[PDB]
Design a protein around this ligand. Structure first.
Ligand code: HEM
Ligand code: HEM
Ligand SMILES: NCc1ccc(C(=O)N2CCC3(CC2)N=C(N)c2c(F)cccc2N3)cc1
Ligand SMILES: NCc1ccc(C(=O)N2CCC3(CC2)N=C(N)c2c(F)cccc2N3)cc1
Ligand SMILES: C[C@H](O)[C@H](O)[C@H]1CNc2nc(N)[nH]c(=O)c2N1
Ligand SMILES: C[C@H](O)[C@H](O)[C@H]1CNc2nc(N)[nH]c(=O)c2N1
Lengths: 417, 417
């Protein structure tokens, strides 16, 4: 009937019933796998079978009208009929603006790996389903970036491009994120910039983009429209807001010459809703300090500044047991938060975020008897057990609507020219 | 054929084949659940069915002889025959000392939640399968504690009590750990000592144990022998080695009056091997600093000293974004490591431990194509992504031999007197 969940920090118990509405993934528990097939929705070469589409469409429409505080029975029935007829006569159907808005928010609510879901009801939706060219995609994206950045007062938004038709005319953003720094393999063998974007940077260069060989060069947008070859578009520098890193006490921190972008936006995910699939739907929220201070700046395969910060603090960087790494990573986190705050750019520390999600989870179980959550992604990369999420048992399941991963476009794309 | 595993810090790929030898657990991924049924092996009221026992026995014997560098075919066949005959004539069978040693080490190797498995081959085995009374259990346990403590130079050991026969004569240690501090609900409503042991402490008191109402009172051993009612035995103070907490710089840290025991030993788990079950098999290794500094001292449901340490450091304890918690927990971790080191008591910091396990995992895949690992338990409660384990994809599966959890004895015990 329900799965029992326990919070070992408060002793509180919760009953999960929502998992029954899961779509089942089948299968050596693969919890720590980053990109499993169960969270990936691949490409197609033919339209969605009507026997599959119609049932999902009905299901979604029922969910939509079932969300209203005061039911609108006639509208419900009418919409059910209109959708069916549209599917029979066209082979698919178009969501109303309100349905799309509901779908985007529900898919956000259903994102197990997002710790900021308490904000789920606050989301700006940009309808670009009429987009037809790469140039138009670029314009829509620039508008998204501008609205979201909002001069430092970050706002959550999502831009919905045309849904997948037959699978050969997909709208896709080849970039993993809207804003990301380039990575270069220098002549002397050293790596410059973000080491994690070496391959994608080389791809942009291969497509005509001009490499600037800097530490923080913003990558261009590689846009695919109507299934045609991807076109490169440089992001107008005036639209990219950045924060220069400074430490409240360590004046030498500035000497590191570090900075980061204010806008965190995923650009390569697919929105699934009522049998439909939107291969291009970039969305954004705001940053959590640890993402930059810990992952971007301290991962060894990224900027890897940990040791350098250690020496500058005068720590015993040659003795692991000294816990110098713990001390350093924290000052870096302090720098990130301090800089964003000083420059009036929205950001949240991991402690506040963790308590925020706990409140949300509590609200979700009360509202719909559950909240899909991936513990591995919800617990911060530092001070894990200091946050309440660490002590909270969670159930991870895939509902609908949902935001899926996709197979890298360059691996499945059929080149024309 | 094999599952692909990737380390995102080195890019290294691994092929897991060992998971095929898993015993299958069936089923809303329940990865973050602490005590799931799949990791629990409950009580019985009748002997193990021969149709089930024999196949497992054969399987184990084959594994044992199959581990030798230079095969001993005749011995193998002979043992297979002897076991079968013993099972038919007695209804069960006895493992040889060497088989038990192999079983205990293999079960350790198969513990997905243990980060210290690189030491798997270094284990002292105490054969107490001839034990018959609670008094004898107490003596065996005191010997274990003495050998393991070794005046600060901690040694890994396990004491194997008589295997389960019919299920009504089980040898069980009611304590979760060999050494643990009491928790008291004081008259003024405040909690004194380890808040997590309130219930078990009350149980000891109900069994005649005399409460000392201290902050660090070592709990007595509650021993069950031959299925009879549990008897209480106080642990001789001379056998309990403790470390007084001091900070290398903060002279005021000592004013906190903190200390902890040097011997980390689980006492309520069950060893499963070749169809047999040993409900009582206490084992120990050595401490990892974070267990004490982070979980014992900083969990809110435990000693909860975080805020107090924060104020004493003069931090902004009323502003989460200041990251005062991160700064404090680290100094506490520094104190723990410093104190254990100064007092010459074996301990490992989480960084060294993490790199140690990574080496082990590498060895395991090379040796047998796999290593069962629970990421959620292997990543430390602080500085998660700073350790390599965080970036390592892992497969969690249950093999055999294996150390299982058990249903709390006081919930299933049938009282005599
Ligand atoms: C209100 C601000 C928001 C905050 C602070 C927030 C924060 C986060 C964080 C910290 C992560 C983990 C990132 C990583 O480790 O790669 C994440 C993941 C995610 N978020 Fe949220 N988020 C917000 C808004 C949104 C919005 C508006 C959507 C979608 C409509 C969303 C969808 C997701 C999804 C699908 C993931 C998983 C991405 C992946 O698998 O790489 N989030 N978010
Ligand atoms: C050589 C020293 C060893 C170290 C440093 C070590 C360390 C650890 C640590 C840190 C944990 C997690 C504890 C927790 O969070 O509750 C653990 C769990 C575990 N260890 Fe090891 N260990 C060692 C030896 C052993 C030995 C000798 C055995 C058994 C023969 C063993 C069996 C296990 C098992 C079964 C678990 C899971 C316990 C549970 O689920 O509560 N370990 N160990
Ligand atoms: N593995 C290397 C890597 C990955 C992602 C980013 C990146 O640009 N990020 C990190 C993930 C990201 C979006 C910004 N961070 C958020 N706060 C975010 C968000 F606010 C909403 C939805 C998804 C998000 N994910 C940088 C580097
Ligand atoms: N949840 C409250 C709690 C749990 C366990 C202990 C405890 O005594 N511990 C923590 C777990 C423990 C054994 C010592 N720590 C180890 N290093 C250990 C070990 F060395 C070998 C096997 C199992 C172990 N587990 C204290 C408090
Ligand atoms: C192997 C492991 O799944 C991987 O390193 C993880 C774990 N936890 C994470 N959690 C978040 N939020 N983001 C991540 O990228 C990861 N990566
Ligand atoms: C809910 C969650 O499983 C629980 O808090 C965990 C997680 N990680 C852990 N990891 C270890 N090593 N030990 C623990 O007790 C826990 N507890």
């Amino acid at each position: 009937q329900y799965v029992r969940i326990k919070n070992w920090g408060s002793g509180e118990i919760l009953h999960d019933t929502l998992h029954h509405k899961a779509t089942s993934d089948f299968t050596s528990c693969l919890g720590s796998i980053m990109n499993p097939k169960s969270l990936t929705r691949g490409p197609r070469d033919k339209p969605t079978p009507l026997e599959e589409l119609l049932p999902h469409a009905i299901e979604f429409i029922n969910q939509y009208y079932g969300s209203f505080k005061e039911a609108k029975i006639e509208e419900h029935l009418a919409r059910l009929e209109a959708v069916t007829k549209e599917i029979e006569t066209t082979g698919t159907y178009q969501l109303t603006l309100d349905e799309l808005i509901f779908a985007t928010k529900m898919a956000w609510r259903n994102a197990p790996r997002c710790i900021g879901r308490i904000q789920w009801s606050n989301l700006q939706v940009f309808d670009a389903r009429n987009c037809s060219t790469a140039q138009e995609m670029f314009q829509h994206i620039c508008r998204h970036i501008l609205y979201a950045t909002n001069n430092g007062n970050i706002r959550s938004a999502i831009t919905v491009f045309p849904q997948r038709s037959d699978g050969k005319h997909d709208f896709r953003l080849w970039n993993s994120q809207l804003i990301r720094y380039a990575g270069y393999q220098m002549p002397d063998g050293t790596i410059r910039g973000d080491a994690a974007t070496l391959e994608f940077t080389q791809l942009c260069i291969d497509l005509g983009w001009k490499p600037r060989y800097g530490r923080f060069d913003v990558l261009p947008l590689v846009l695919q429209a109507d299934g045609q070859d991807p076109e490169v578009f440089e992001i107008p520098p005036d639209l990219v807001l950045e924060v220069t890193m400074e430490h409240p006490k360590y004046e030498w921190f500035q000497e590191l010459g570090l900075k980061w972008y204010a806008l965190p936006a995923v650009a390569n995910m697919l929105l699934e809703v009522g049998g439909l699939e939107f291969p291009a739907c970039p969305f954004n929220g705001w940053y959590m300090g640890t993402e930059i201070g810990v992952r971007d700046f301290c991962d060894t395969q990224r900027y890897n500044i940990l040791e350098e910060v250690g020496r500058r603090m005068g720590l015993e960087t040659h003795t692991l047991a000294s816990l110098w790494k713990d001390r350093a990573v924290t000052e870096i986190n302090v720098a990130v938060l301090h800089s964003f705050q000083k420059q009036n750019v929205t950001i949240m520390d991991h402690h506040t975020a963790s308590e925020s999600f706990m409140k949300h989870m509590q609200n979700e179980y009360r509202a719909r008897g559950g909240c899909p959550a991936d513990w591995i992604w919800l617990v911060p990369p530092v001070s894990g057990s200091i946050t309440p999420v660490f002590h909270q048992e969670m159930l991870n399941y895939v509902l609908s609507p949902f935001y899926y991963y996709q197979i890298e476009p360059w691996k499945t794309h059929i080149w024309q020219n």
